[PDB]
Amino acid sequence: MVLYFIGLGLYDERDITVMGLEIAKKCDYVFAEFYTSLMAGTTLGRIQKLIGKEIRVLSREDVELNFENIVLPLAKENDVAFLTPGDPLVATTHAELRIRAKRAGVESYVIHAPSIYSAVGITGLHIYKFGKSATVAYPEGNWFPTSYYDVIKENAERGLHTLLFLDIKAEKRMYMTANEAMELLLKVEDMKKGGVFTDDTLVVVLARAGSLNPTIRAGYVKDLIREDFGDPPHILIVPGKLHIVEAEYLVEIAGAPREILRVNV
Amino acid sequence: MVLYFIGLGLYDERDITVMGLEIAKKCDYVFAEFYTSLMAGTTLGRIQKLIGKEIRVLSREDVELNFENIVLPLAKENDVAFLTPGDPLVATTHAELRIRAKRAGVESYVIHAPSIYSAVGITGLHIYKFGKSATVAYPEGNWFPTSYYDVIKENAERGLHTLLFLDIKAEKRMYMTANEAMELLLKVEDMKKGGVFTDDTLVVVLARAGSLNPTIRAGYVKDLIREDFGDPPHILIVPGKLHIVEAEYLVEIAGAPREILRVNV
Ligand SMILES: Nc1ncnc2c1ncn2[C@@H]1O[C@H](CSCC[C@H](N)C(=O)O)[C@@H](O)[C@H]1O
Numbered sequence: 110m111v112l113y114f115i116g117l118g119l120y121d122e123r124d125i126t127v128m129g130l131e132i133a134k135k136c137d138y139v140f141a142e143f144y145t146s147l148m149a150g151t152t153l154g155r156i157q158k159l160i161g162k163e164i165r166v167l168s169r170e171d172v173e174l175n176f177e178n179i180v181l182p183l184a185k186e187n188d189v190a191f192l193t194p195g196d197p198l199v200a201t202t203h204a205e206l207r208i209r210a211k212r213a214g215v216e217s218y219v220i221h222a223p224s225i226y227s228a229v230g231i232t233g234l235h236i237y238k239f240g241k242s243a244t245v246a247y248p249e250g251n252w253f254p255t256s257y258y259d260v261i262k263e264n265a266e267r268g269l270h271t272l273l274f275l276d277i278k279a280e281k282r283m284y285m286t287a288n289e290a291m292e293l294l295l296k297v298e299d300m301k302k303g304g305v306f307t308d309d310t311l312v313v314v315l316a317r318a319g320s321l322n323p324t325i326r327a328g329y330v331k332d333l334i335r336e337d338f339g340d341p342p343h344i345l346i347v348p349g350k351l352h353i354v355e356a357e358y359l360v361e362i363a364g365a366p367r368e369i370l371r372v373n374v
Numbered sequence: 375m376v377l378y379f380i381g382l383g384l385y386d387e388r389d390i391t392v393m394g395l396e397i398a399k400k401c402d403y404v405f406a407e408f409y410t411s412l413m414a415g416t417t418l419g420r421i422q423k424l425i426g427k428e429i430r431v432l433s434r435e436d437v438e439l440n441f442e443n444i445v446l447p448l449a450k451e452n453d454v455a456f457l458t459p460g461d462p463l464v465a466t467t468h469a470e471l472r473i474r475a476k477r478a479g480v481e482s483y484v485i486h487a488p489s490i491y492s493a494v495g496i497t498g499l500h501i502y503k504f505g506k507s508a509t510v511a512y513p514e515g516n517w518f519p520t521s522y523y524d525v526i527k528e529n530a531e532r533g534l535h536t537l538l539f540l541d542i543k544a545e546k547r548m549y550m551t552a553n554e555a556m557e558l559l560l561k562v563e564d565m566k567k568g569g570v571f572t573d574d575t576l577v578v579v580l581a582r583a584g585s586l587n588p589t590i591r592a593g594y595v596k597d598l599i600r601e602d603f604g605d606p607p608h609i610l611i612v613p614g615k616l617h618i619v620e621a622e623y624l625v626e627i628a629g630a631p632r633e634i635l636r637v638n639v
Contacts (some may be wrong), residue, residue, distance in 0.1 A: 116488075118393075118486070119486060121393070122392075123391065123392040123396070124391050124392070124393055124486065125392055126390065126488065127387075127388040127389070127391070127395055127424075128388040130392055159392075195492075196488065196492045198495035199492045199495045199501050200501055202619075204496075204498050204619075204623055205619055205623065207498075207623070207626075208622060208623060208626045211626055211627070212626075219496050220586075221383075221384065221389075221492070221496075221584060222391070222488060223381070223391060223461060223486035223488055223489075223492075224488070224492035226489075226491060226492040226501055227461045227488075227489035227491040227492045228461065228486050230463035231462075231469075231484050233463075233472075235466050236464050236491060236507070237507040239504075239506075239507075240505050240506055240534070241502060241504070241505055241534050242501060242502035242504070243502060263532060267506070267528060269505070269506055274502075319486060321483050354470055358469050358473060361476060362472060362473065
């Protein structure tokens with residue numbers, strides 16, 4: 110009679126919360142999507158094995174067009190679950206699915222999980238200092254998205270950090286890397302020239318958060334653009350003016366150039 | 375030789391991730407702190423029972439002044455776990471502890487869990503639209519802090535949502551309610567008079583995030599400043615201009631007045 114939105118976490122199946130595991134385990138039907146993000150440490154099997162249920166994986170289409178046709182009806186007479194990577198409501202449109210559940214007479218519940226949005230705290234950057242967020246999207250045809258560039262600008266003026274979610278094309282199995290993102294940013298700089306993103310801008314890269322050996326790096330674009338951060342998923346962060354402790358961490362932990370320690374108050 | 379920072383999640387003892395509960399059980403020693411926050415939906419006893427390890431609670435002084443004399447020494451020759459509410463390293467000072475671990479030649483790994491920063495997505499407000507964050511502190515003595523007001527000013531000005539943490543006297547186990555926070559904001563408005571927070575201002579209140587039955591309420595200050603949002607802690611959110619999808623979710627899910635569909639979009 111109820112629908113459960115359950116996050117699976119950052120990297121592998123275990124990143125699910127105890128609450129989530131016990132709820133899934135006792136659900137009649139189990140659905141899930143793997144297009145809003147990439148969990149690089151698991152497979153559908155492990156998930157099924159860990160949960161003890163078969164999972165019917167839905168596509169973006171199935172969801173954005175037929176959620177209320179494929180999943181809701183079932184919830185009407187059973188306890189159904191819908192699994193997603195990270196937290197199910199962060200940087201997605203799944204929140205709107207809840208309204209569909211309401212309009213279908215189905216009560217829904219959200220079981221949170223660790224999200225990349227807060228996991229970036231491992232970069233040593235103060236979470237409260239992050240400003241507006243944005244996504245570096247793959248250009249399509251002659252359409253070249255640029256707004257994410259303005260966000261960085263607007264935040265930096267206020268001294269706020271910018272969190273840049275990198276694009277993903279699950280079906281095409283395309284996962285944007287920090288490098289490609291840095292590449293697109295540089296090209297946007299040329300056609301705007303706002304002195305916002307250049308070879309001397311400081312950036313921070315976080316790859317595969319949730320894994321025990323994630324890639325945490327900070328430095329100048331020039332020195333990082335061609336660097337290997339390992340397999341996806343990747344996220345890019347353009348920090349604002351740093352606090353001494355943030356810099357001390359970036360250097361001591363992310364291998365940033367000791368010269369960022371000498372902050373220009 | 376290994377120090378494990380494990381997040382306990384948001385509300386009860388079931389909010390810890392499966393990876394966290396396993397790494398915790400296999401540790402030799404287990405520390406925890408409940409000064410940055412409390413798990414209002416559980417107890418130290420229930421967490422101890424779930425992990426099967428006695429837990430030593432450290433104070434804000436035990437950590438900020440003697441982390442290296444209390445926890446790291448044991449981490450040199452054993453597997454030690456440091457448990458904290460929410461997601462590790464989100465609390466602005468916990469990051470430098472990893473630096474202390476590095477300095478002591480100790481290995482450290484961060485085991486994530488749900489944070490209030492990502493969990494607030496249950497309000498239906500888009501995550502990327504959150505700006506700088508802040509804490510509403512109680513005035514006291516001759517000290518009357520008001521920055522959180524300006525934070526709201528700069529975010530709403532750029533159409534960004536402001537996440538407001540409410541003061542907590544962790545030790546005395548005393549919380550600031552959402553109602554109290556509003557009353558304080560009105561007084562700040564009444565003094566600075568910047569057209570930021572008034573009776574007509576729209577706010578969102580989140581309580582007990584992480585439990586299956588969170589309180590999600592949205593509406594105008596004048597109709598919510600005296601409303602009963604249940605037990606603490608409470609999170610207050612002052613939204614910026616809303617996306618129609620956001621407003622609809624606040625109406626359909628958080629019981630907000632239809633008036634917001636024409637006044638706040
Ligand atoms: N474990 C991880 N490590 C690094 N980046 C990650 C990540 N998980 C997600 N991301 C980033 O966020 C994008 C997916 S956005 C969807 C996020 C999800 N709801 C959550 O709560 O995490 C990815 O393309 C990537 O840029």
